[PDB]
């Protein structure tokens, strides 16, 4: 009965850890998109 | 019955824990990529 409840809890935690770490990941995806455009557009005004 | 209940939870934990394992490995490379993109800028801005 114990290992049953214990594994229930961990499941809810892993299901939510999925959501959490992906919001962390996403913030880095967003950043890595933006930083690239800021690299590029700077050079896109610098270029000759 | 309680061992069956034990089983599909152990099993589903393995699915979940690997999704979560992926999200942190995906997270690593994105931290690293952000790193170098942030570099490319801060080097380049030292002439503006």
From Swiss-Prot, chain A:
Domain of life, source organism: Eukaryota
Domain notes for this protein: The rodlike tail sequence is highly repetitive, showing cycles of a 28-residue repeat pattern composed of 4 heptapeptides, characteristic for alpha-helical coiled coils. Limited proteolysis of myosin heavy chain produces 1 light meromyosin (LMM) and 1 heavy meromyosin (HMM). HMM can be further cleaved into 2 globular subfragments (S1) and 1 rod-shaped subfragment (S2).
Family in the record: Belongs to the TRAFAC class myosin-kinesin ATPase superfamily. Myosin family.
Function, as annotated: Myosins are actin-based motor molecules with ATPase activity essential for muscle contraction. Forms regular bipolar thick filaments that, together with actin thin filaments, constitute the fundamental contractile unit of skeletal and cardiac muscle.
Something else known: The cardiac alpha isoform is a 'fast' ATPase myosin, while the beta isoform is a 'slow' ATPase.
Assembly with partners or alone: Muscle myosin is a hexameric protein that consists of 2 heavy chain subunits (MHC), 2 alkali light chain subunits (MLC) and 2 regulatory light chain subunits (MLC-2). Interacts with ECPAS. Interacts (via C-terminus) with LRRC39.
Organism: Homo sapiens (Human)
Compartments reported by the entry: Cytoplasm, Myofibril; Cytoplasm, Myofibril, Sarcomere
Name of the protein: Myosin-7
Disease: Cardiomyopathy, familial hypertrophic, 1: A hereditary heart disorder characterized by ventricular hypertrophy, which is usually asymmetric and often involves the interventricular septum. The symptoms include dyspnea, syncope, collapse, palpitations, and chest pain. They can be readily provoked by exercise. The disorder has inter- and intrafamilial variability ranging from benign to malignant forms with high risk of cardiac failure and sudden cardiac death. Congenital myopathy 7A, myosin storage, autosomal dominant: A skeletal muscle disorder characterized by prominent axial and proximal weakening, spinal stiffness, severe scoliosis, with or without respiratory and cardiac involvement. The age at symptom onset can range from early childhood to late adulthood, and disease severity ranges from asymptomatic to severe muscular weakness and respiratory insufficiency. Histopathological examination shows variable findings including subsarcolemmal hyaline bodies in type 1 fibers.
């Amino acid at each position: 009965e114990a290992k049953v409840k214990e594994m229930n809890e961990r499941l809810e935690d892993e299901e939510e850890m999925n959501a959490e770490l992906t919001a962390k990941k996403r913030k880095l995806e967003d950043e890595c998109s933006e930083l690239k455009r800021d690299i590029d557009d700077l050079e896109l005004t610098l270029a000759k | 019955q309680l061992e069956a209940k034990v089983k599909e939870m152990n099993e589903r934990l393995e699915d979940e824990e690997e999704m979560n394992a992926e999200l942190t490995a995906k997270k690593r490379k994105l931290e690293d990529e952000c790193s170098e993109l942030k570099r490319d800028i801060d080097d380049l801005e030292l002439t503006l």
